[PDB]
Amino acid sequence: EFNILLATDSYKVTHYKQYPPNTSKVYSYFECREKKYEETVFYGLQYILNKYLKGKVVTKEKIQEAKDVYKEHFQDDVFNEKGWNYILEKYDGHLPIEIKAVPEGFVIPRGNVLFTVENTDPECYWLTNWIETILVQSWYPITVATNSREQKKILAKYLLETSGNLDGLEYKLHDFGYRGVSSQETAGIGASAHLVNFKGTDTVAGLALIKKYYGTKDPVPGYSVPAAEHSTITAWGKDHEKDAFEHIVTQFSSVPVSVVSDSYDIYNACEKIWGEDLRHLIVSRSTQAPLIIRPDSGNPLDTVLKVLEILGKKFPVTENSKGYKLLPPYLRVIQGDGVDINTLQEIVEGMKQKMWSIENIAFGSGGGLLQKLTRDLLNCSFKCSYVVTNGLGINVFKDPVADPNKRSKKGRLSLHRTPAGNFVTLEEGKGDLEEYGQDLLHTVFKNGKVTKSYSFDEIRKNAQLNIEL
Amino acid sequence: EFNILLATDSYKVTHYKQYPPNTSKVYSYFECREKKYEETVFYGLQYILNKYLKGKVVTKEKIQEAKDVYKEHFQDDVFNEKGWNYILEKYDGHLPIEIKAVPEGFVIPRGNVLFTVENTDPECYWLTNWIETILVQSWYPITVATNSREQKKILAKYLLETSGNLDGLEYKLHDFGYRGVSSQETAGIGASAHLVNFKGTDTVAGLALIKKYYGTKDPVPGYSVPAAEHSTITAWGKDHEKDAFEHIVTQFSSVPVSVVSDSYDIYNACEKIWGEDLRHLIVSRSTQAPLIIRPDSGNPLDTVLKVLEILGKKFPVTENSKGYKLLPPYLRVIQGDGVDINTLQEIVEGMKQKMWSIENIAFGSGGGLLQKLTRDLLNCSFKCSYVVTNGLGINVFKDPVADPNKRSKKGRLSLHRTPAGNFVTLEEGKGDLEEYGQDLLHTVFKNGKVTKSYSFDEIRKNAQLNIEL
Ligand SMILES: Cn1nccc1C(=O)Nc1cccnc1
Ligand SMILES: Cn1nccc1C(=O)Nc1cccnc1
Incomplete structure (x- = not known):
């Protein structure tokens, strides 16, 4: 049977020890980064949500098997068993994750946010980017x-x-x-x-x-x-x-x-x-x-x-x-x-x-x-843009000096319709000003349930x- | 659940009507066709045999589900229900197919036979190329x-x-x-x-x-x-x-x-x-x-x-x-x-x-x-080379006039060690002459069972x- 605790990049297992202490929220997004193929069809997310992410995805047996594999895979005991137990006990194996996404089939130009991923529980801050690989x-x-x-x-x-x-x-x-x-x-x-x-x-x-x-x-x-x-x-x-x-x-x-x-x-x-x-x-x-x-x-x-x-x-x-x-x-x-x-x-x-x-x-x-x-064709990327440490939300991003084309967006994102009918992604939580229309992103996954199909x-x-x- | 009846190319469903009447045997092979990457690593076949081909792969329910889909997929009723029921009744769902193959891990030069596929029952002549798509x-x-x-x-x-x-x-x-x-x-x-x-x-x-x-x-x-x-x-x-x-x-x-x-x-x-x-x-x-x-x-x-x-x-x-x-x-x-x-x-x-x-x-x-x-990189191909109709076996092949590189091998094939210790593929059943060593291909699958691992x-x-x- 499929085990989501074994469905991530190996190094991500050690990432819960690397985030800044007192981090309560990790907020990441997805985009077909700019720089033919000027517009992309958003499709496939719903498949992954139902088959891999929804419902009870964590059991006592899956935590044990994951611990046994990673014990030998790393030759060390790096595994957030305590973090996976919290999800098993408090949420019955349901992932405390909220995923908002543009309606499937929508043709959005390059450089726009297609879906956002964040955690709904301050203890599961690490869970946001754990499921990057599967969402990518x-x-x-x-x-x-x-x-x-x-x-x-x-x-x-x-x-x-x-x-x-x-x-x-x-x-x-x-x-x-x-x-x-x-x-x-x-x-x-x-x-x-x-x-x-x-x-x-x-x-x-x-x-x-x-x-x-x-x-x-x-x-x-x-x-x-x-x-x-x-x-x-x-x-x-x-x-x-x-x-x-x-x-x-x-x-x-x-x-x-x-x-x-x-x-x-x-x-x-x-x-x-x-x-x-x-x-x-x-x-x-x-x-x-x-x-x-x-x-x-x-x-x-x-x-x-x-x-x-x-x-x-x-x-x-x-x-x-x-x-x-x-x-x-x-x-x-x-x-x-x-x-x-x-x-x-x-x-x-x-x-x-x-x-x-x-x-x-x-x-x-x-x-x-x-x-x-x-994946290089449309530059489909998954990056973190917003975190909250010590109760203070800060806007984070990557910006390699030798490659401006790999720069990421900052803060909380939101997709909107321009006055000319086109699309625009607002950064730094500017979407709350409501100078544009309603956020086109709809909540499709929340706390282990598919909320929109x-x-x-x-x-x-x-x-x-x-x-x- | 996986359905082998639904794991083939669509047009292959209508192929049983297209072979010459009174065909008792369909013998096909696999190769990394000739014309860097001069030698290939044979690997992965064993996975496909166990997960998809071995055991009872045919049930009454799967035959019905396949029939209902193909009826709508073709807007007509071209589906060998009689052929898939024969396997279910006589072989308990087990595929009457013999697969001979080169040991996995073996590094074989281009243009050599890696594995062969044939039917062990004259009623299942159409079965050899049905499973082409999955073996390819x-x-x-x-x-x-x-x-x-x-x-x-x-x-x-x-x-x-x-x-x-x-x-x-x-x-x-x-x-x-x-x-x-x-x-x-x-x-x-x-x-x-x-x-x-x-x-x-x-x-x-x-x-x-x-x-x-x-x-x-x-x-x-x-x-x-x-x-x-x-x-x-x-x-x-x-x-x-x-x-x-x-x-x-x-x-x-x-x-x-x-x-x-x-x-x-x-x-x-x-x-x-x-x-x-x-x-x-x-x-x-x-x-x-x-x-x-x-x-x-x-x-x-x-x-x-x-x-x-x-x-x-x-x-x-x-x-x-x-x-x-x-x-x-x-x-x-x-x-x-x-x-x-x-x-x-x-x-x-x-x-x-x-x-x-x-x-x-x-x-x-x-x-x-x-x-x-x-699949173009190593020119991995699956072609028929030998059939038996009316008691007489004939050596068949393809040979496009515009592309000599797509020419296929003829008749029953066998893999041997040359006197210099290299590899060679014998065609037209010349392997039975035994001028070379024994056939290097082992029987790895026969009548629904994995015979070699x-x-x-x-x-x-x-x-x-x-x-x-
Ligand atoms: C450098 N390294 N050592 C162990 C794991 C990695 C790593 O960076 N892995 C990785 C995997 C997938 C995508 N990006 C990086
Ligand atoms: C032209 N056509 N109509 C129905 C099926 C096909 C066809 O050629 N399919 C096909 C699929 C894969 C490889 N080769 C041929």
């Missing part, structure tokens, strides 16, 4: 959701330019990163952060997380279609790629089907196998059930352009109202290899260059969507694009 | 342990060059990546992969994983020392950093203590505070309990050099047998900011340039050790450096 890990669902949303803007910009609308926008970027993530739990968290912006996913784990921790009125927040992998094709034999294609498109004739065709020669399959041999099986398919050709190798941009040109001369192409070329509705293309935010831009710009509408293309990202993200439907509404509004 | 996720503990071991080589190369020995080599790279990872499960897996090569860790979660899934004769596989964070320093006020330093070095006067000093001015803390104001507290410290100054900002190389040069002219410096400068035993340094495999090389080379010994320095790595890694002590022995041997 919300950087990942924030980063995934933010980067997925930035890719959505690119998709939206080019789709509108070449088609005239945003039809099927939330199905332009599919999640392939189940096998590409570091762990099972990661896949669930990551896929759920992608579903904030899109509806297409293959990481099944992300569905159960949302249903349990957030919830949707629809049965599921994500969907998928029958598709093929290289094994289901190559197992027929190198001389039976046509038999493989025909068997698959017939098994799924009334539903959308994606077939990978780069097993031996992607350009041969499209022109000869799809475009001649099995051309009769494609032109008969319904609009609601087209064939989706999936290339998986070569230069991403160059392959897509070459695939389209091949299909263009083997299938009746129409020029849309915007002047861009569109395949017949029974044939689409999905690029699911080596696609991140950088190459996504390069591809759709290349398609616009060759007068190809974005209607023709769908994208699949794996490690680039879920794994190729760090958000459904996944609310998060989707909050994280909408401006072009969609 | 072993890329992470492999990639971490490999990249960690590569950094160990660099440390060993310079430490030996500048000290004459390798004393304390396994404490030169400390894990800080608990807050830098995507999830809790990741933190445990990653830290355990780093502990294969080092003993310095702050990610507590990794210890419980090893004890449960691998085990060591020593109480714990990892260790840590009392250290300070920015909050435990700044809380004293900006005008009382000296009082902060003094209080911490006194609380831990008999044990090694690491104190961060980049809060306001790193170069002032070393020369004025450590080097003048509190110099008397440092020179009295034991050799087994020194002060470890920790910078955390500015250019990693430039900061370390300047810090060392400062400490050089405030504290008595000795010159070892190798001619490299050495701090007194009661004074050491640890750089734990922006340290990956690339910058690590830059720092130690810079230290050798300025006649500084590696004995003086230790390194802390967070996101670079546990997060800044993808390795302790973390064996894995550590197998992952030793050639310089250590």
Whole structure:
């Protein structure tokens, strides 16, 4: 079973002996520190609150096991057993911590406070930064959701330019990163952060997380279609790629089907196998059930352009109202290899260059969507800004001489709306002057209880694009 | 509860309809495909076998829950309920799958077979690639342990060059990546992969994983020392950093203590505070309990050099047998900011340039050790190479025309020792000819049971450096 006493950075175990004596309060905050990615999607905190932080998290057995581990881990008896006993006795293992946070899904610019953490009991001053490590890990669902949303803007910009609308926008970027993530739990968290912006996913784990921790009125927040992998094709034999294609498109004739065709020669399959041999099986398919050709190798941009040109001369192409070329509705293309935010831009710009509408293309990202993200990307940091010693509250902060970009904020923080509708974080407890609006931060966790929740439907509404509004 | 039926890629649910009819066997393998990092550390498979694959992994409830989700996920009823009921009824939920693998800890060059997967029942041909996604996720503990071991080589190369020995080599790279990872499960897996090569860790979660899934004769596989964070320093006020330093070095006067000093001015803390104001507290410290100054900002190389040069002219410096400068035993340094495999090389080379010994320095790595890694780095892949249809077995493979580096192996594979004592992967069942030795791959999983295990002590022995041997 998970033990929160074993879920922190090792050196934090020795931090209760390092704070100034007579300290009754430790007040820390979280931010995507300033110095692309100018605005971030706040999401994932609620998951951590329910799974790891809420309820009775401290027992007699967990204190003992922690004491035994740290005894050997440090070769010394540095462990605030007395501090963890106080929480067990006076609060029945419930954490005396108050967490205020901006509503999940909210798109806040860089350099703003996203959530604040403080203790509600003067004895548990050390508890504030004990749970830093576990709260910092919300950087990942924030980063995934933010980067997925930035890719959505690119998709939206080019789709509108070449088609005239945003039809099927939330199905332009599919999640392939189940096998590409570091762990099972990661896949669930990551896929759920992608579903904030899109509806297409293959990481099944992300569905159960949302249903349990957030919830949707629809049965599921994500969907998928029958598709093929290289094994289901190559197992027929190198001389039976046509038999493989025909068997698959017939098994799924009334539903959308994606077939990978780069097993031996992607350009041969499209022109000869799809475009001649099995051309009769494609032109008969319904609009609601087209064939989706999936290339998986070569230069991403160059392959897509070459695939389209091949299909263009083997299938009746129409020029849309915007002047861009569109395949017949029974044939689409999905690029699911080596696609991140950088190459996504390069591809759709290349398609616009060759007068190809974005209607023709769908994208699949794996490690680039879920794994190729760090905490340095959005500068997600957790710092202390306020403490009270001897009954005197002082404003604390870090300010390295060689790096102004690592400077922290001072005093009690509060998020507000500017007169121009933008955001502003007030420092030094200036929010109590009420020269601005009400503090946007709502208490979501207090004394071991989740005090405010958000459904996944609310998060989707909050994280909408401006072009969609 | 974990559901293996919900732990696969979405499109893999529809794959049982796509294989050629009368398919009795699906035989797939795993490799760190060819075309630095020329040899990889095999590790993490045993964890996935025990936690996810072994025992009764199929129940009536899990089959129903999977059916209900996939029904809504696909808006249709494509789900091999008959296939998952066969396993439940005939094998009591136990997976009829045989997995052969190279002993964990083994350092195998790129392009070799690490493990193989096949079905032991002709009815469960579709089962081999269903569990691809979960077995592929072993890329992470492999990639971490490999990249960690590569950094160990660099440390060993310079430490030996500048000290004459390798004393304390396994404490030169400390894990800080608990807050830098995507999830809790990741933190445990990653830290355990780093502990294969080092003993310095702050990610507590990794210890419980090893004890449960691998085990060591020593109480714990990892260790840590009392250290300070920015909050435990700044809380004293900006005008009382000296009082902060003094209080911490006194609380831990008999044990090694690491104190961060980049809060306001790193170069002032070393020369004025450590080097003048509190110099008397440092020179009295034991050799087994020194002060470890920790910078955390500015250019990693430039900061370390300047810090060392400062400490050089405030504290008595000795010159070892190798001619490299050495701090007194009661004074050491640890750089734990922006340290990956690339910058690590830059720092130690810079230290050798300025006649500084590696004995003086230790390194802390967070996101670079546990997060800044993808499945692309080592080209970890899982492809089918052999199937049996209509009684006849055929050697299958993929071979993209535009990318020769994605070509897969053919037929039944086996790993052997070359006459020169190196590794080689035999294809097309040439291993049965027995022109080489016996197959080095051991059966580690069969019909739901773990048939072979390795302790973390064996894995550590197998992952030793050639310089250590
Ligand atoms: C295009 N498509 N539609 C449904 C599923 C897929 C697909 O290709 N998925 C996928 C996931 C992970 C790795 N490879 C392919
Ligand atoms: C230098 N040191 N010695 C023991 C622990 C640490 C340390 O600074 N750890 C750490 C962990 C995570 C983030 N930041 C620092």
